[PDB]
Structure formats: structure tokens, C-alpha cells
């Protein structure tokens, strides 16, 4: 009269990568790194803004250059991985019998699932801190519906234009908050309303920016540059592929920017990929023996908003591995 063991199963850990997810369209991963070595976190920009030469003799149309200093955000991420010393004791011991060899391989797998816990901790920690930067520099859309439009500003911030900009904030907070709620209450204005709100977001954001370069993060189907990325939750992701219906690319971005981290970012997880944990511990056991004798596709949907092909991506799946708040 036996008891059966029908099987014991375990889940694979999905190796996220910041240069694999679509949130790295918003952040360039450069090869300078002097500013972390630099004490002062500022950097001084010599920008040059054009101006219209006046035709009348109101005032001389002088040149304009701004010297703007931009202070960097130096963040520190730190987890912990408690690892028990009675596994360390069989790490240091050399095994000779298959019971202790099985215990040694089990403790090596325990350590190889601690360093991999560290890599999968800081990789989600990196993307979490990136997301927490982009929630620290994002005033909401009901401000940039007006303040990013030069029809109110650039005549001089007087008492009056601020006194009307506050009251116009009060209108877009009412008639235009919770925009995906009104699209459900509206009938055949399903598709073009949400296209209107998304393209107004793109027009309110994409403006003058210093420190430009080549067209980074091209897609695969058309080859155009990706203008921006839309981080959303899963419910709005499942909705906004139906209000839009069709996507420009087949969820593939083709960025050749990921070339200087295929050598630099892969050999950091390959050294803890259990081929190298066992190899380094075999080398340490050989030293103990020596002692007494003496480019790529990116999974990201591309929608089209007029001319700019932004991307949409939901990281809810990544935050749900942790069972933490989004």
C-alpha cells in the first residue's frame, strides 16, 4: 500500500534585461561614465537658441545663448541575499563520495541561485529606478495640454497669464481627466479619440532637447525611428490594441544600439550561469588540492500616431513576478 510521488516541478526565472525591454528607448546607455567618477553631479551645457531678427527698431535683436547646468541623479540600489554558512562549509570542503557530491552540487546550485537572484534583483532594481526617475520628471498631461502649447506662454509670465493658466488647468482636469473612461461612454468615437489624446501627448512632450545624435531604436517593418514609449498597465494594454486595432510592426524593434552591451552585459550573467559557478569552484578545489603538497529583435508593439511611431509596452508582467505594487 504505497504513496506515489507524481512529480515535482519548478518555475524558470525569466531573465529581464533593461536593454531588452522597451523602457530603454527613453534612456541612452552611454560609454563615457566620467560623471559618476566626477565629484560634482552637474554638467554645464553651452546651448544656442536662435532668435528672429527684428525688423523694427523696437529693441536690438541680440544673440541668445543659455548656459544651463544640469545636475545628475546618482541612485543607489541594494538588496540582500542571506546564504547559510553550513552550505559554505561544504563549498570549502572537497567531495569524494556521491552523497557528499550530491550535497555539494546542491549547495553550488543554491549559490548559483543566489548570484542569479542578485542579478535578477538588480536588473529589476535598475528598471524600477528608471521608472521612478520617469515618475519624478513627469508632470501630468493636464498641465502639458496647455503649458506645452506656446499660445499661453512666451508672452511674459505676468500675473494674468498665470491667473488664466491656473483656471485652464482646472478645465482640463475636469473635461479631460480619465480619458479612457470617456472613450467607453462615447459611441463611434472609439478610435480617433484615443488617437487624439495620444498624439496630443506626443506633441506636448517631443520638443527641444539637447544632446542629440543618430536615429536610435529603429523598428523592423518600416525602419523608422521610434519616437517614444508608452509604459502602461495590462488592462490598458489589452484595451489599446483594440481601440487602435492594428500595430505598425509585428511587436519587433530592431535596434543596433544593443551592440556594446552584448559583450559587456552578457558576460556578467554568464559568469553566474552555473557553467561558471561550478567552473570557478572546481578551480578553487584545484587550488585546495595544490595547497598541502607544497541587432536583436525586441518584443515591443509599435503603434502609429501620424508621423511618429511610438511604442507601447506593459511591465506589469515584470512587477508581478515580485508580487509588489506597480
Amino acid at each position: 500500500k504505497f504513496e506515489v510521488l507524481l512529480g515535482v516541478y519548478t518555475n524558470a526565472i525569466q531573465y529581464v534585461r533593461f536593454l531588452e525591454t522597451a523602457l530603454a528607448v527613453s534612456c541612452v546607455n552611454t560609454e563615457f561614465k566620467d560623471l559618476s567618477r566626477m565629484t560634482d553631479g552637474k554638467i554645464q551645457f553651452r546651448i544656442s537658441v536662435p532668435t528672429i531678427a527684428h525688423g523694427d527698431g523696437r529693441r536690438p535683436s541680440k544673440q541668445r545663448t543659455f548656459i544651463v547646468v544640469k545636475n545628475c541623479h546618482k541612485h543607489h540600489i541594494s538588496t540582500e541575499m542571506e546564504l547559510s554558512m553550513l552550505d559554505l562549509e561544504i563549498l570549502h570542503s572537497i567531495p569524494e563520495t556521491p552523497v557528499e557530491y550530491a550535497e555539494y552540487v546542491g549547495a553550488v546550485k543554491t549559490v548559483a541561485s543566489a548570484l542569479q537572484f542578485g542579478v535578477d534583483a538588480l536588473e529589476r532594481g535598475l528598471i524600477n529606478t528608471v521608472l521612478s526617475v520617469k515618475l519624478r520628471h513627469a508632470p501630468p498631461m493636464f498641465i502639458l495640454q496647455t503649458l506645452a502649447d506656446p499660445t499661453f506662454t512666451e508672452r511674459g509670465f505676468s500675473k494674468t497669464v498665470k491667473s488664466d493658466l491656473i483656471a485652464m488647468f482646472k478645465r482640463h482636469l475636469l473635461e479631460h481627466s480619465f480619458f479612457l473612461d470617456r472613450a467607453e461612454n462615447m459611441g463611434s468615437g472609439f478610435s480617433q479619440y484615443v488617437r487624439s489624446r495620444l498624439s496630443e501627448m506626443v506633441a506636448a512632450v517631443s520638443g527641444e532637447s539637447v544632446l542629440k545624435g543618430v536615429s536610435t531604436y529603429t523598428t523592423a517593418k518600416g525602419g523608422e525611428p521610434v519616437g517614444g514609449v508608452f509604459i502602461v498597465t495590462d488592462n490598458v494594454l489589452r484595451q489599446l490594441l483594440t481601440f487602435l486595432g492594428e500595430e505598425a510592426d509585428n511587436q519587433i524593434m530592431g535596434p543596433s544600439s544593443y551592440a556594446s552591451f552584448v559583450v559587456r552585459g552578457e558576460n556578467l550573467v554568464t559568469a553566474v550561469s552555473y557553467g561558471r559557478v561550478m567552473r570557478t569552484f572546481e578551480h578553487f578545489m584545484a587550488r585546495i588540492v595544490d595547497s598541502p603538497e607544497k541587432r536583436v529583435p525586441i518584443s515591443a508593439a509599435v503603434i502609429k500616431l501620424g508621423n511618429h511611431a511610438v511604442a507601447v509596452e506593459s511591465l506589469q508582467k515584470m512587477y508581478n513576478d515580485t508580487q509588489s505594487p506597480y
Binding site: 560609454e31 563615457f32 566620467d34 544632446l211 542629440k212 545624435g213 543618430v214
Partner: peptide
């Protein structure tokens, strides 16, 4: 010029540089 300032600022000399 003793440093690695090429990919931070870009390729062009008319828009950007040192």
C-alpha cells in the same frame, strides 16, 4: 583629447562636440 567623449555627445561637429 585624453578622454572618451565621443558617444555621449554624438558624431556631428556642427551641432555638438567639445
Amino acid at each position: 583629447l585624453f578622454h572618451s567623449f565621443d558617444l555621449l555627445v554624438g558624431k556631428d561637429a556642427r551641432e555638438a562636440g567639445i
